[PDB]
Amino acid sequence: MHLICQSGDVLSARYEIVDTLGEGAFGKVVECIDHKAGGRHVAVKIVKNVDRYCEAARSEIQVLEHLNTTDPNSTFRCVQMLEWFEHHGHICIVFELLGLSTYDFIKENGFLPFRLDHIRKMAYQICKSVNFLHSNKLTHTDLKPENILFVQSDYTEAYNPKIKRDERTLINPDIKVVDFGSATYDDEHHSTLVSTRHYRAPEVILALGWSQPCDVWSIGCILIEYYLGFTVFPTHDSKEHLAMMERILGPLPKHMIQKTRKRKYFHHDRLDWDEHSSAGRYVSRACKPLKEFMLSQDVEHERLFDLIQKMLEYDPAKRITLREALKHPFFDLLKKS
Ligand SMILES: CN1CCN(c2ccc(Nc3nccc(-c4cnn5ncccc45)n3)cc2F)CC1
């Protein structure tokens, strides 16, 4: 992989590598000068030569040709793919250049949460963009802070004596959504497993089928991370996740516990869980009812926490849609002149 990129390398006799932006399971994204587009800077994703990622990359291109044709102005803030190509048998996708991820900024800002007026603007653009997928019979399936990128990443730094550390604040918190490698059409085959551990919806964990709603869950989880600076679901393990869900959101619905073919996770009608074990005590300590995480009782926090609660509905049918989410009172303050 690194054998196929170094600063100075030229790709498709067009793109000159100046910087690695970041790496991942997929491969790496590099910043390039495009010599045949007036020296415009672009991001190029170089995909690991594994069929798994090869397949993912190829569908990502078909989804983005679709989204780009449907929204040529990029009004719904999906990342714009400019073109793609092959370099030593690795698939390469060229995008408009974006800054670092909402995850990166949190991490670099000392794992501090975003301030609320930024969460509102970011939550809206995430909901508008992902709803545009939902309007076009697509589910992203893999929403997480890492896959939400800032257009501009520039920030001011200032010492907050409220928290006794230096705090970084975005100038422009505008975001776009990336990684359509896992995006599935309503008419296409649905994988048994989708989404990253912490942002997996309960319908997905319990193998009850999934669709647009499994995205709304993930967003719910994103907005908590932004509010706190850490996930409220810190775990790799499936059963542990449901146990944390139970402590924060309350008991799983009767019908979902009934219908699930993953009966490994249940003992009659309750989660098969020794609360007095390694994972057990950890959950009792690390989790509490959702509303006990609110840092303020200010009206603006409660209306955010009402949306998060609506997004974390256990039943995907009842679960608020993003068309409704965009109407929620939390966003009234964006629409005031
Ligand atoms: C530890 N962090 C270090 C920073 N990393 C990082 C920062 C900025 C971009 N930029 C960029 N621009 C346009 C498009 C894309 C993009 C398209 N598709 N994808 N897919 C997955 C991830 C990014 C993108 N990325 C890229 C970076 F990797 C992430 C990992």
Residue numbers in the entry: 147 to 483
What's written in the study?
Extracellular signal-regulated kinase 3 (ERK3) is a poorly studied member of the mitogen-activated protein kinase (MAPK) family. Similar to ERK4, ERK7, and NLK, ERK3 is classified as an atypical MAPK. Despite potentially important functions in cellular processes and tumorigenesis, no ERK3-selective inhibitors have been published that could be used as tools to elucidate the roles of this kinase in normal and pathological signalling processes. To contribute to recent global research efforts on untargeted human proteins, we present the crystal structure as well as the discovery of inhibitors of ERK3, providing a foundation for the development of selective inhibitors for this poorly-studied, atypical MAPK kinase.
In order to provide structural insights into inhibitor binding, we attempted to determine the complex structure of ERK3 and inhibitors. Unfortunately, we did not succeed in obtaining crystals of any complexes, either by co-crystallization or soaking. Therefore, we determined the structure of CAF052 in complex with CDC-like kinase 1 (CLK1), which belongs to the same kinase group (CMGC) as ERK3, and performed structural comparison. In CLK1, CAF052 adopted a typical type-I binding mode, utilizing its 2-aminopyrimidine core for the interactions with the backbone of the hinge residue L244. Structural superimposition demonstrated that although sharing a low-sequent identity the binding mode of the inhibitor, as well as the contacts with the hinge region observed in CLK1, could most likely be maintained in ERK3. Nevertheless, other interactions observed in CLK1 might differ in ERK3 due to amino acid variations. This included the contact between the inhibitor piperazine and the αD D250 in CLK1, which might likely be absent in ERK3 harbouring N117 at this position. In this binding mode, the pyrazolopyridazine group was expected to still bind within the back pocket of ERK3 and form a contact with the β3 catalytic lysine. Nonetheless, other interactions engaged by this moiety were presumably different, due to the substitutions of a F241 gatekeeper and V324 in CLK1 for Q108 and G171, respectively, in ERK3. This structural comparison therefore suggests that ERK3 likely shares similar mechanisms for accommodating inhibitors to that of other kinases, enabling binding of various inhibitors that are developed for protein kinases from diverse families.
